[PDB]
Subunit: 92 residues, 6 copies
């Protein structure tokens, strides 16, 4: 379909550009694995700390699940910006 | 000096927590290498395209150096948020 | 070349999806025109105010060129996020 | 009440400045309509895909509702920054 | 344990640097108090307005709890960036 | 002129709402003073370190002026979001 040629901003890309975009994506998958690992650590920390009210309150005050979510969003939009720097669409 | 114990929010950390923070940092160094690589690609692209006004205008309109900078800032603040999710400082 | 099929995350798209992505892009071009208009207003404001030190200091303290730049970056990354919500790449 | 004169940062505005602020707001309402349209598309996509587990998993992995929400927040804060570039409050 | 010396990026800090970091943190606690105050105002506003459908719809359309949450996240990441400007870790 | 009534989104405000907005602004001026203080510290640090190439390279690698600028932008947009949570404009 060459669907991309139907989207505004399309630019033809070299293999080097594609490889660089794929590299950002592969590095991102390593961050995704790391984030899943941190999330499992947090789930365990909470489970172990059940019934310890002071530690449950400490975890709630630290808001680690929220901070992990912020980090995930920043990593992903950062990847998107690096890829746009490579792909260089001809649109605003 | 135990300087960190002089900073508000200090919490004692386990080795697992330190290892996880170091992992985020090591993955970040891979992104830093990737960003330096993209930046060199851009420098070459501009050099090759000197005197080709239409392509110099295309590069200026795509603003790839700006987009790369945005991506770097997002990757770094994302790392900071994941590390805070691990370290869990006891402060706002 | 079907270059996009060489990029990780590729998904086939319907015409409706392409139309929606093009609509975001067209609305973005209206914002780009608006931002260029505001930038010209600022250039005039500064020119008129040359030699009026108090008003030059007021403009420098308000930092309108910086705020306009922040707005441009937010509009553009917002467009990128809406387009990802439509295109739904199969990658992190 | 002239309530705005009770808020720090107040600056008197010209009609041109008000018109420009209203234009950003009107362009924003077009983006709000577009975002509502994308949200309805997503609701349909999910409904059609109910019982197709592989496609429900694809949608959940793509997180399009989250990405649309990120785009909405960026469009709105971008509007706020362009308006501050026009209005130029005399405060930090 | 000198745990911080086990984290990459560690740099020794002066008392002035620690005092400056503590000041950012103390100013942050004032913002946290302010945000809690605004949140209580919103809870009251909603309670008073129960049964007034037009005003409940106005509040839902204004999304003040969402905007307050965005402000909290920006204040906190801003604090983190100022503290990094002071602490100057030797890592990406 | 009641200029604000000419801007879309206008809502009448109570004195409590105005006081809360002014409080955010006053707390912001304390952050602005703190940021100016950190900026002066950085200027001194650089001056003292002139001719010490290793320390000049350390400062350049830490990018503290950039991080301080990021923090300033986050503090200011955070203030803007808290104020919108108070003022609750009737527009997107
Ligand atoms: N208690 C909680 N647990 C997990 N995620 C949370 C949370 N509170 C908020 N969030 C998430 O944190 C980010 C900033 O608000 C948002 O994620 P995004 O995706 O980015 C919230 O959904
Ligand atoms: N022409 C250009 N070249 C390189 N970086 C640029 C640029 N214009 C802007 N920037 C940088 O892009 C980010 C968003 O504005 C900012 O980086 P930070 O660091 O994040 C600008 O300094
Ligand atoms: N005096 C000035 N004039 C124009 N743009 C400026 C500026 N100071 C900073 N910037 C730009 O404002 C954004 C936030 O720092 C960045 O843009 P980006 O692109 O996003 C700066 O480059
Ligand atoms: N499953 C989901 N559906 C809709 N919105 C979601 C979501 N998960 C997170 N969000 C929203 O996405 C933004 C970044 O986390 C936040 O919106 P804001 O508003 O910006 C979340 O509430
Ligand atoms: N109805 C609501 N009430 C409170 N917080 C909300 C909300 N909808 C979204 N959020 C929160 O607003 C930020 C931007 O989406 C995110 O917070 P963070 O933490 O940052 C959402 O969780
Ligand atoms: N060497 C430097 N010194 C001071 N500010 C810098 C800088 N490099 C970039 N910036 C500024 O840091 C923010 C993120 O890029 C942007 O500020 P804003 O304003 O936000 C850049 O202008």
């Amino acid at each position: 379909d060459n669907q991309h040629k139907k989207i505004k901003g399309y630019r033809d890309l070299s293999q080097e550009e594609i490889d660089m975009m794929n590299r950002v994506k592969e590095l991102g998958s390593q961050f995704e694995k790391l984030i899943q690992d941190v999330s499992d650590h947090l789930r365990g920390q909470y489970n172990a700390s059940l019934h310890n009210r002071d530690e449950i309150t400490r975890i709630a005050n630290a808001e680690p699940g929220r901070w992990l979510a912020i980090g995930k969003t920043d990593i992903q939009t950062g990847m998107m910006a690096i890829i746009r720097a490579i792909a260089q669409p001809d649109s605003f």
